[PDB]
Amino acid sequence: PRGVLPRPCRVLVLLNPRGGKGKALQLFRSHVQPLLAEAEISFTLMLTERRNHARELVRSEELGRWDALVVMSGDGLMHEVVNGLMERPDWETAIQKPLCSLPAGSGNALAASLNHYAGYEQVTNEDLLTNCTLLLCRRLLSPMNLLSLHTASGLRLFSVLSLAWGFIADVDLESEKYRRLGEMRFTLGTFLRLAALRTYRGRLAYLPVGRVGSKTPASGPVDAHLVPLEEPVPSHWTVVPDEDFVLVLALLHSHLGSEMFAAPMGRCAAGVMHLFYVRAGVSRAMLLRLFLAMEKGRHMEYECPYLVYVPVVAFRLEPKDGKGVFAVDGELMVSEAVQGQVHPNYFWMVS
Numbered sequence: 001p002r003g004v005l006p007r008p009c010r011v012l013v014l015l016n017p018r019g020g021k022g023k024a025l026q027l028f029r030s031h032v033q034p035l036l037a038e039a040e041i042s043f044t045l046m047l048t049e050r051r052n053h054a055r056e057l058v059r060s061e062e063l064g065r066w067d068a069l070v071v072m073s074g075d076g077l078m079h080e081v082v083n084g085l086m087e088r089p090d091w092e093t094a095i096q097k098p099l100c101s102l103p104a105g106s107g108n109a110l111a112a113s114l115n116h117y118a119g120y121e122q123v124t125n126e127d128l129l130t131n132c133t134l135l136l137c138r139r140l141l142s143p144m145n146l147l148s149l150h151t152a153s154g155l156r157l158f159s160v161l162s163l164a165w166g167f168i169a170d171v172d173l174e175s176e177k178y179r180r181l182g183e184m185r186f187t188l189g190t191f192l193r194l195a196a197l198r199t200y201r202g203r204l205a206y207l208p209v210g211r212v213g214s215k216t217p218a219s220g221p222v223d224a225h226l227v228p229l230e231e232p233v234p235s236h237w238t239v240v241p242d243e244d245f246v247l248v249l250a251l252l253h254s255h256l257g258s259e260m261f262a263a264p265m266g267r268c269a270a271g272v273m274h275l276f277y278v279r280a281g282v283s284r285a286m287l288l289r290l291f292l293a294m295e296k297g298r299h300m301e302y303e304c305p306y307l308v309y310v311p312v313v314a315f316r317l318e319p320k321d322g323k324g325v326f327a328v329d330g331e332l333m334v335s336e337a338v339q340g341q342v343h344p345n346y347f348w349m350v351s
């Protein structure tokens with residue numbers, strides 16, 4: 001399925017100005033605006049001031065007046081937007097409002113992925129901003145998967161990009177102290193965490209796409225592959241025997257950053273996400289090799305037996321590692337048992 005924005009069209013631009021090392025508004029004016037004017041895209045800028053501001057704005061927004069919502073930021077702002085749409089009473093129609101991700105200078109994994117799918121070379125910073133803006137100007141829409149998440153505490157959350165636990169989430173946390181470095185904050189965080197490598201105790205189970213296929217089962221949204229966290233996972237799932245991990249990563253897209261091609265095995269099918277995990281026992285040196293190889297998406301060629309990849313429609317993760325974190329679409333939260341189901345072709349993105 002494909003769709004197209006009308007011409008002219010009218011979009012809302014949600015922009016975080018204290019973001020892009022404080023340059024997002026300037027970049028919008030210099031790199032985005034002239035292209036929108038030429039493509040007959042009129043806009044209104046709405047500025048975000050703090051965490052969840054966008055979530056609460058989109059939750060209460062009159063959506064009928066916009067042809068799309070444009071988010072100019074990192075991955076976190078898009079997370080907030082989609083979560084705002086999904087918590088509305090009219091969520092079933094609100095989630096069908098076309099969305100567009102423009103990177104603001106501190107990176108954006110979703111924008112990098114969309115640039116990749118469109119056939120562009122793996123560019124960064126202003127070049128990436130330009131390409132993603134040209135995709136908006138071209139007006140074509142593609143459906144994206146959405147991961148519906150439930151935690152032991154009853155939290156209900158949606159993920160457009162990733163859920164990370166272990167090493168990756170710890171890097172997301174550590175890297176908040178280094179925002180001045182831009183996207184390289186994640187590389188520094190990786191080295192620091194690698195220097196202090198640890199494993200994390202927990203249990204992982206998943207429902208591979210091969211077992212049931214990606215069609216949504218009849219019982220919202222309804223997550224009919226899930227049973228309650230207080231019950232054992234269903235007998236037809238796969239339970240991983242390992243009790244200790246270096247990391248676990250659910251990933252809906254090809255990239256973890258503009259220069260991190262994490263999932264080179266092809267764009268996800270409708271209703272399917274990538275699941276990666278790294279088993280305990282791997283060396284620091286191999287983990288470094290894998291990290292560096294991820295730039296050109298060559299890390300799977302090592303055939304390291306500690307790195308396992310599987311395409312899934314659902315999963316459950318039960319951390320038993322004491323106080324820790326998850327990163328959901330790069331956003332930090334306290335870790336606890338969690339499970340999720342992928343919904344196919346659930347929203348539209350400019351792409």
Ligand SMILES: Cc1cc(CS(=O)(=O)c2ccccc2)cc(OCc2ccc(CN3CCC[C@@H]3CO)cc2)c1
Pocket residue numbers: 075109162164167168169171172186190194249256257260262263276278287288290291294299307327328329330
């Ligand atoms: C030592 C190491 C090794 C690897 C390469 S690996 O182990 O081959 C691999 C490949 C695919 C999926 C998972 C793991 C990946 C790695 O990634 C660290 C890292 C941490 C944060 C981010 C940026 N965040 C913020 C946006 C979303 C994303 C995850 O939350 C990127 C990379 C660290």
